[PDB]
Structure 1
Amino acid sequence: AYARTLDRAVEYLLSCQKDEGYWWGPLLSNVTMEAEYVLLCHILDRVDRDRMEKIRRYLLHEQREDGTWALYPGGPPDLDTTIEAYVALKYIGMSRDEEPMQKALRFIQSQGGIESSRVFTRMWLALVGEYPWEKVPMVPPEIMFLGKRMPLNIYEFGSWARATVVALSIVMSRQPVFPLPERARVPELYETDVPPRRRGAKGGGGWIFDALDRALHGYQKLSVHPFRRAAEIRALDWLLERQAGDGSWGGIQPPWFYALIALKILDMTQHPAFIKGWEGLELYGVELDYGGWMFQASISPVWDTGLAVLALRAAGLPADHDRLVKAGEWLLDRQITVPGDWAVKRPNLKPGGFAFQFDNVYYPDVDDTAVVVWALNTLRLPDERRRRDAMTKGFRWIVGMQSSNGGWGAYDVDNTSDLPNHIPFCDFGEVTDPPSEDVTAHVLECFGSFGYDDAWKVIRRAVEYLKREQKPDGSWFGRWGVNYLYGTGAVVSALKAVGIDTREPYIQKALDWVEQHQNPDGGWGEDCRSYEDPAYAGKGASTPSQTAWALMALIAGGRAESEAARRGVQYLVETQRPDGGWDEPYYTGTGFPGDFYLGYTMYRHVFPTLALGRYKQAI
């Protein structure tokens, strides 16, 4: 039955593999990436008419009937995302009259206008002079002076926020303005009667910070700020030191863009770092067949390769398959062997983790490291020495990264300060990197592949963490994947792997929860709205990936020979395309709960294959 499904899925995956031996699906987000790029180009005075065109096609193509843009496909209109697209288009050439611009304008106005947008949006506009800098939360270069153990020092922030802060402190220090031509001025963004509904700091704003901001904005106005020249250089140097190999910073869009703007402010356009930073951009861009062009928020080569391998193995291919070896070798060359920012909390920990993108040595993450090390543990490579060695280095690094509560974060250890969540500036997504259930799960499943069971203290401290986090309905939150189906699947699968008993109550309470959300069509689906409204937990159109996740939770919990189980397998079998792949018009990936969503192009092919491979194992 499914065998033909599985067989076609395999050969399909194998066809996507690149020559070098890795997999790499494009990462999907939203138009703010491309829109901000257009503005970045204006700032850097490097506008390519041809590119602007491909960018306009993409922007329009993404706009919906109502004239808005959302974070995820089929999501509510987003003000920020729409404002930035509006300005972007207007700059490229669209007149405020044209149908598309008209519809957008309405929605923006009906929302309170520009005054209701997140800090970033108002800041970008501030950069081109369409909004007063005085009204933008201030972040001073001086933050660079705070010591390792002090409130708000830059190591209290999550890796992704950190670099962005450092880069912006230089920008906000000089508060530069790169004027748009009259043709693109967007005053109309203010023309609204609706009361401005401003978003506040992620965790509530204490009058202290509010005060501190006003203070900083006044200090900004002074004629002489002592030790600021130093403060700036401290930031610039912090940047120059960490620049990624591909010319980016952290391998993510934000800091990268701001870092380039910072170097531009400092007349360093003829510096190696800026040049490399600029041309490195092209690697993230993507030519769309319909004439458009998009920019990836980040890239997932290592991640894709890691899961690809685990899926093809669980699916059947030999641990020494010559095609899976191309991958295994490639992964060994990726391992990071130098201290990253994580070392600030673990100076005696030996390097050995892996990153998400291609070349990002200073920021490996526990998730990639766990999946990559685990994947390697399922292969038989020519040089058994390097495989044995690589796994051990990574394995040890993972252990040494375990946080206090017994779970694992992504990039740091105990990055749990609650302090930064109240600053005015921080009103978008996560700003700290605390332990999460999904990462912790992947780690346990990784250790489980080696054997290490509930006997080892590390495993127990973690399982304790998971048990305490389990939700009332027996489900588990999904931090980096949408959502409860993603988390529950991860945990149950992991717990099964570390020896724990699948018969326990909490495991059953979970398994039941999964069967209880199986859509009519046999599959499972969870809409990104489940982060905003609990009524959507486990609800949503069925997707290949999410179906596969709920399916793994069941297979793992013993209910592989169930109705719900066989039903779900049927779904994947029927919905499969002729080439062997699957389709998935919805996002199943999470960047920041309720704020930033991602589309993992490979998920739709890899997880169904993995789930089917594990089902075939159950018989």
Structure 2
Amino acid sequence: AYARTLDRAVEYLLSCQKDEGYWWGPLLSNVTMEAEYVLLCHILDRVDRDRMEKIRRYLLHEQREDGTWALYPGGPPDLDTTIEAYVALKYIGMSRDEEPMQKALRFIQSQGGIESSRVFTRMWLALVGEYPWEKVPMVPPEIMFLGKRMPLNIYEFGSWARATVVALSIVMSRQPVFPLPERARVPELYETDVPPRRRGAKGGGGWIFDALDRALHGYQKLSVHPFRRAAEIRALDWLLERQAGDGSWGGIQPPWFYALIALKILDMTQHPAFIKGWEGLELYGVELDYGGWMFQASISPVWDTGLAVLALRAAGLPADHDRLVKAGEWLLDRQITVPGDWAVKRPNLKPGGFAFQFDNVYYPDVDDTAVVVWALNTLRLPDERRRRDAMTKGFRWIVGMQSSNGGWGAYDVDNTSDLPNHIPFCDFGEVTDPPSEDVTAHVLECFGSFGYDDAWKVIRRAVEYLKREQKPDGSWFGRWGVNYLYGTGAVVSALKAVGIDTREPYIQKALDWVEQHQNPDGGWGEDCRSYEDPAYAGKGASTPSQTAWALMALIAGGRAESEAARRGVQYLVETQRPDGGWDEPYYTGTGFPGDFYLGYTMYRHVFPTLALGRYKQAI
């Protein structure tokens, strides 16, 4: 039955591979990327009219009938996202009169106007002189002076947040303004009768920081500030030292964008870092077939390549397949062999991790590494001297990254500080990088592929962590992939890989939860709403990737013979395209739970292939 489905699936993945031997599907997010880009270009005084047009097209192609934009397809209207899209559009040429503009405006005013938007949106607007700097939370460059064990120091923030803070402290230290032309002003974002509903920190705000902020703004207006210029240079140096090979900062847009702004302010437009930073941007841009242009919040080549191999190997391809060889070779060259910000917690730990993007040496993440090491373990390459060596290096790196509670985070060890989640400034997404279930689940299966079982103390502690984290209904939270279906699928398959008896009470409870959520069509869906409302747990339209995850949960749980499993396969077989791939108009990717979602273009193809391959071998 599934046989032809597999063959087509396989020949399809092979056609998507590059000549260098890697897979690289685009990463889908939301309109703010390009809205802020537009804004960025204004500040930098480097506007390409042609580029603006392709962006104008994209913003419109993305706006829904109601005149709004969401964080994910099919999601509720987002104020922040809509406000920025509105401004970019107005800067481009659109007059407030036009249909798209009007409908947007209405929504914006009904939500409390500009005063109801997040700090970032207000800040971006402040940068262009459309909102008082004094009403934006201050981040002083002096934060650069706080030491390693001292509270609130930069190393208490998650990777993503860390660079963003440093870069922003320079910007806020100067409170610059790049006035929009009179034609692009947007005072209309203020015209509202609705009281502005303000959003606090990610977990409540203390009146102290509230007081502190006012003090900071007052200190900002003093004629002199000692050691200020010193802290600025500290921040500048920090950024100079940590720039990525592609010119970006962290391989993600926020810090990159702010860093570029920071250098502009400091007359460093003729400086090497700025140049590479600016020109490096193109690599992240994507030309859309309909005449549009989009910007990637980040890029997933290493991730995509890692999974594709696993999928293709599970599909049935041999370890020595000339194509997979091309991939394993590439992967090896991608291994980081120098210390990064994680070394601040592990100075004696020898580097050997892997990063998400092409060249991001200071920020390898466990999730990538765990997958890449595992994937490498399946292959049979010419120089197994370098293969065994690379695996060994990666393996020990992962082990050394384990956190206190027995689980793994993404970038740092024990980035569990609670303090940062209370600051006024932090009202958008995760600020710390604490351990998560999924990453731990992947790390576990990685070890498992090597033969290590429950006997090993490392793995034992890990399992203890998972068991304690299991939800009441026997499900597992999906941190990076779209919820419970993702989390559960990841964990269960891992438990099986480390010699755990799937017969267990808690493991069976997980499998039941899975079956009890299957859709009529025989597939599995989970809307991104499962982050806000618990009623949406494992509830949504069926998607190839999610169906496949839940399917893995069953295959690993010894339930491949189940009825549930049979309809699952059928779904994929039926919904598959003639070319070999699957469609997926929904996001099954998670950046920040509740605030930022992702569309991993490859998921819809890779997972079903992996899931299917695993099913065939289960016979």
**TM-score class, shorter:** over 0.9
1:583 Cα offset (Å):
0.2
1:440 aligns with 2:448: no
Q: Which string of whole-angstrom CA distances, capped at 9 and with x for unpartnered residues, describes residues 556-596 of structure 1?
A: 00011000001100000000000000000000000000000
Q: Distance in 2 between matches of 1:397 and 1:242?
A: 21
Q: Distance in 2 between matches of 1:317 and 1:497?
A: 20
1:355 Cα offset (Å):
0.1
1:234 Cα offset (Å):
0.2
Q: Distance in 2 between matches of 1:470 and 1:110?
A: 40
Q: Distance in 2 between matches of 1:586 and 1:277?
A: 32
Q: Which string of whole-angstrom CA distances, capped at 9 and with x for unpartnered residues, describes residues 223-265 of structure 1?
A: 1000001000000000000000000000000000000000000
Q: Which string of whole-angstrom CA distances, capped at 9 and with x for unpartnered residues, describes residues 190-233 of structure 1?
A: 00000000111101001111111111111111110000010000
Q: Distance in 1 between matches of 2:344 and 2:610?
A: 37
Q: Distance in 2 between matches of 1:373 and 1:298?
A: 22
Q: Give secondary structure in 1 for the equivalent of 2:156.
A: coil
Q: Distance in 1 between matches of 2:197 and 2:151?
A: 30
1:374 Cα offset (Å):
0.2
Q: Give secondary structure in 1 for the equivalent of 2:150.
A: coil
Q: Give secondary structure in 1 for the equivalent of 2:477.
A: coil
1:535 Cα offset (Å):
0.6
Q: Distance in 2 between matches of 1:123 and 1:168?
A: 10
Q: Which string of whole-angstrom CA distances, capped at 9 and with x for unpartnered residues, describes residues 47-68 of structure 1?
A: 0000000000000000000000
**1:243 paired residue number:** 243
1:370 Cα offset (Å):
0.2
1:81 Cα offset (Å):
0.1
1:41 Cα offset (Å):
0.1
1:64 aligns with 2:64: yes
Q: Distance in 1 between matches of 2:516 and 2:209?
A: 45
Q: Distance in 2 between matches of 1:565 and 1:387?
A: 36
Q: Distance in 2 between matches of 1:222 and 1:162?
A: 28
Q: Distance in 2 between matches of 1:429 and 1:416?
A: 15
Q: Which string of whole-angstrom CA distances, capped at 9 and with x for unpartnered residues, describes residues 165-188 of structure 1?
A: 000000000000000001000000
Deviates more, 1:359-368 or 1:209-218: 209-218
Q: Distance in 2 between matches of 1:393 and 1:590?
A: 29
Q: Distance in 2 between matches of 1:504 and 1:10?
A: 35
1:325 Cα offset (Å):
0.3
Q: Give secondary structure in 1 for the equivalent of 2:599.
A: strand
Q: Which string of whole-angstrom CA distances, capped at 9 and with x for unpartnered residues, describes residues 393-449 of structure 1?
A: 000000000000000000000000000000000000000000000000000000000
Q: Distance in 2 between matches of 1:443 and 1:487?
A: 13
1:284 Cα offset (Å):
0.1
Q: Distance in 1 between matches of 2:545 and 2:195?
A: 41
TM-score in terms of structure 1 length: 1.00
1:455 Cα offset (Å):
0.2
1:77 Cα offset (Å):
0.2
1:277 Cα offset (Å):
0.3
Q: Give secondary structure in 2 for the equivalent of 1:174.
A: coil
Q: Distance in 2 between matches of 1:32 and 1:384?
A: 45
Q: Which string of whole-angstrom CA distances, capped at 9 and with x for unpartnered residues, describes residues 538-570 of structure 1?
A: 000000000000000000000110000011000
Q: Distance in 2 between matches of 1:268 and 1:418?
A: 36
Q: Distance in 2 between matches of 1:202 and 1:367?
A: 24
Q: Which string of whole-angstrom CA distances, capped at 9 and with x for unpartnered residues, describes residues 591-610 of structure 1?
A: 00000000000000000000
Q: Distance in 2 between matches of 1:579 and 1:150?
A: 57
Q: Give secondary structure in 2 for the equivalent of 1:294.
A: strand
Q: Which string of whole-angstrom CA distances, capped at 9 and with x for unpartnered residues, describes residues 249-302 of structure 1?
A: 000000000000000000000000000000000000000000000000000000
Q: Distance in 1 between matches of 2:384 and 2:173?
A: 53
Q: Give secondary structure in 2 for the equivalent of 1:598.
A: strand
1:453 Cα offset (Å):
0.3
Q: Distance in 1 between matches of 2:376 and 2:112?
A: 53
Q: Distance in 2 between matches of 1:212 and 1:423?
A: 10
Q: Distance in 2 between matches of 1:215 and 1:477?
A: 40
Q: Give secondary structure in 1 for the equivalent of 2:501.
A: coil
1:21 Cα offset (Å):
0.1
Q: Give secondary structure in 1 for the equivalent of 2:378.
A: coil
Q: Distance in 1 between matches of 2:559 and 2:318?
A: 27
Q: Distance in 1 between matches of 2:244 and 2:341?
A: 13
Q: Distance in 2 between matches of 1:426 and 1:212?
A: 15
Percentage of identical aligned residues: 100
Q: Which string of whole-angstrom CA distances, capped at 9 and with x for unpartnered residues, describes residues 67-114 of structure 1?
A: 000000000000000000000000000000000000000000000000
1:390 Cα offset (Å):
0.1
1:528 Cα offset (Å):
0.1
Q: Give secondary structure in 2 for the equivalent of 1:286.
A: strand
| Two-structure CA RMSD over aligned residues (Å) | 0.3
Q: Distance in 2 between matches of 1:478 and 1:134?
A: 38
Q: Distance in 2 between matches of 1:209 and 1:554?
A: 48
Q: Which string of whole-angstrom CA distances, capped at 9 and with x for unpartnered residues, describes residues 132-190 of structure 1?
A: 00000000000000001111000000000000000000000000000000100000000
Q: Distance in 1 between matches of 2:472 and 2:480?
A: 21
Q: Which string of whole-angstrom CA distances, capped at 9 and with x for unpartnered residues, describes residues 363-388 of structure 1?
A: 00000000000000000000010000
Q: Distance in 1 between matches of 2:50 and 2:198?
A: 37
Q: Give secondary structure in 1 for the equivalent of 2:55.
A: helix
Q: Give secondary structure in 1 for the equivalent of 2:590.
A: strand
TM-score in terms of structure 2 length: 1.00
Q: Number of paired residues?
A: 619
1:450 Cα offset (Å):
0.2
1:332 Cα offset (Å):
0.2
Map 1:419-498 to 2 at 5 A. Answer: 419-498=419-498
Map 1:593-612 to 2 at 5 A. Answer: 593-612=593-612
Map 1:305-344 to 2 at 5 A. Answer: 305-344=305-344
Q: Structure 1 unaligned runs (5+)?
A: none
1:520 Cα offset (Å):
0.2
Q: Distance in 2 between matches of 1:332 and 1:472?
A: 41
1:39 Cα offset (Å):
0.2
Q: Give secondary structure in 1 for the equivalent of 2:19.
A: coil
Q: Distance in 2 between matches of 1:473 and 1:333?
A: 43
1:75 aligns with 2:72: no
Q: Distance in 1 between matches of 2:520 and 2:217?
A: 57
1:415 aligns with 2:415: yes
Q: Give secondary structure in 1 for the equivalent of 2:208.
A: helix
Q: Give secondary structure in 1 for the equivalent of 2:347.
A: coil
Q: Distance in 2 between matches of 1:247 and 1:209?
A: 34
Structure 1 segments, 4+ long, off by >6 Å, are none
Q: Structure 2 unaligned runs (5+)?
A: none
